[PDB]
Amino acid sequence: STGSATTTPIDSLDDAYITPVQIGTPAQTLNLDFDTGSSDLWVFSSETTASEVDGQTIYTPSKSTTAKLLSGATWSISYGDGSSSSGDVYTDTVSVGGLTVTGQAVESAKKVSSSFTEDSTIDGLLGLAFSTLNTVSPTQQKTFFDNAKASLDSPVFTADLGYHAPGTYNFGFIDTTAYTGSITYTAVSTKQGFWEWTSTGYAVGSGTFKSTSIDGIADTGTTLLYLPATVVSAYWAQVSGAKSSSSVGGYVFPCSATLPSFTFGVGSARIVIPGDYIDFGPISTGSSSCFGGIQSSAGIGINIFGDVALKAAFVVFNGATTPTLGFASK
Numbered sequence: 533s534t535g536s537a538t539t540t541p542i543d544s545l546d547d548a549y550i551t552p553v554q555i556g557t558p559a560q561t562l563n564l565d566f567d568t569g570s571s572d573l574w575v576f577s578s579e580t581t582a583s584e585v586d587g588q589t590i591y592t593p594s595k596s597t598t599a600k601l602l603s604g605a606t607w608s609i610s611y612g613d614g615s616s617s618s619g620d621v622y623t624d625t626v627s628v629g630g631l632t633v634t635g636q637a638v639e640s641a642k643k644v645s646s647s648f649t650e651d652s653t654i655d656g657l658l659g660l661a662f663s664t665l666n667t668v669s670p671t672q673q674k675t676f677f678d679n680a681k682a683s684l685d686s687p688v689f690t691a692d693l694g695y696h697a698p699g700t701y702n703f704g705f706i707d708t709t710a711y712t713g714s715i716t717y718t719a720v721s722t723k724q725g726f727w728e729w730t731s732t733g734y735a736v737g738s739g740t741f742k743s744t745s746i747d748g749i750a751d752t753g754t755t756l757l758y759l760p761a762t763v764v765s766a767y768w769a770q771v772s773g774a775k776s777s778s779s780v781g782g783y784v785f786p787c788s789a790t791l792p793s794f795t796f797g798v799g800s801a802r803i804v805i806p807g808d809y810i811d812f813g814p815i816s817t818g819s820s821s822c823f824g825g826i827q828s829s830a831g832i833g834i835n836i837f838g839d840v841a842l843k844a845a846f847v848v849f850n851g852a853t854t855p856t857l858g859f860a861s862k
C-alpha cells in the first residue's frame with residue numbers, strides 16, 4: 533500500500549503545516565500537524581475541556597462505529613516549546629492520503645495548553661518519530677507509520693514541505709519526480725527516539741563551506757532551524773543590523789534586509805536554504821524588526837532541523853530495520 537496527502541501551511545509564514553486525516557467510521561476529517569519530532573497521534577475531541585476549544589475541528593469517538601476506548605490508557609505530553617496536552621485513548625481507523633491503519637491509537641485530549649487553544653488551524657498532532665517516545669500509559673502505543681509500515685510497498689515516508697505553498701507527505705514510496713539530482717542518505721541514531729543525524733557542515737551565503745559535524749534532529753513539527761550558537765552568530769553577522777534580542781527571544785533583523793542563504797551538508801551533498809525562507813516577518817504587527825528563522829539551540833540541548841531546513845529539501849524518512857534519512861534538492 534501507499535498513501536499521499538497534501539500538507540498546507542497554516543499561515544503566511546509557514547509556521548506549521550496541516551495535513552487532513554480521516555479518523556473513524558464514518559470518517560471525521562481533522563487537520564493534523566505531522567510531527568517527526570514526537571510520537572503521539574492526539575486530537576481535539578468531544579472530551580476536550582470546552583473553554584480550551586476555539587475553532588478546532590473535534591473528533592467525537594461516540595459517533596464512530598469503529599472507535600473503542602482503550603481501557604485504562606492515558607497520555608500526557610509536553611513539547612519543547614512549552615506547550616502540552618493530555619487525555620485518554622481510543623483505537624480507531626485512521627487514514628492518511630488513502631493509506632488506512634485499523635486499530636490506531638487516537639489520543640483524545642481532555643486538556644490542551646493555551647497555545648493549542650489559540651491556534652484554530654491545528655486539530656491535533658500526528659507523531660512520526662519513533663514509537664519509543666509515545667506517551668501512552670500503561671501500555672505504550674505505536675505511531676501511524678509504525679502500524680502502517682509492514683503494509684507499505686517500502687517502509688518509508690517522505691516530507692516535501694512547500695515554501696509559502698502546499699507540499700506533500702507520501703507513505704510507502706519515493707516520488708522520483710519530486711526532487712532534482714540524487715537523494716543522499718545519512719545515518720540515523722534512534723537512541724533518543726528522534727530522526728537524529730549528523731550534518732557535515734554549513735555555509736553562509738556564497739561563503740566557503742565549513743566542515744563540522746552538527747548532530748540534530750529532522751523535525752517537521754518545529755518551525756525554525758535551531759543550530760549551535762557559533763553557527764547562528766556566523767549567519768546573522770552577514771545581515772546588517774541583526775542582533776540577538778533577549779526581550780524578543782532570539783535573533784531579529786531589519787525587515788528591510790535581503791537575507792543570505794544558508795547551506796547545510798548531508799554527507800558530501802549540500803542543501804541550500806534560500807534567504808527568503810529565513811524571514812519570519814515582523815516581531816509584532818507593524819514592526820520593522822523581523823524575526824529570524826535560524827536561531828540558537830543553546831538553551832534547548834539539541835539542534836533541530838525544523839521546517840526552515842526541511843522545506844528546502846525532499847526528505848526521506850527510511851524506516852527500514854536500520855533507519856536512515858535521505859535528502860535531495862528540489
Ligand SMILES: NCc1ccc(-c2ccco2)nc1
Nearest residue numbers: 611615647648651654753754
Ligand atoms: N514541536 C511540536 C509542536 C507542534 C505544534 C505545536 C503547536 C501548535 C499550536 C500550538 O503549538 N507545538 C509544538
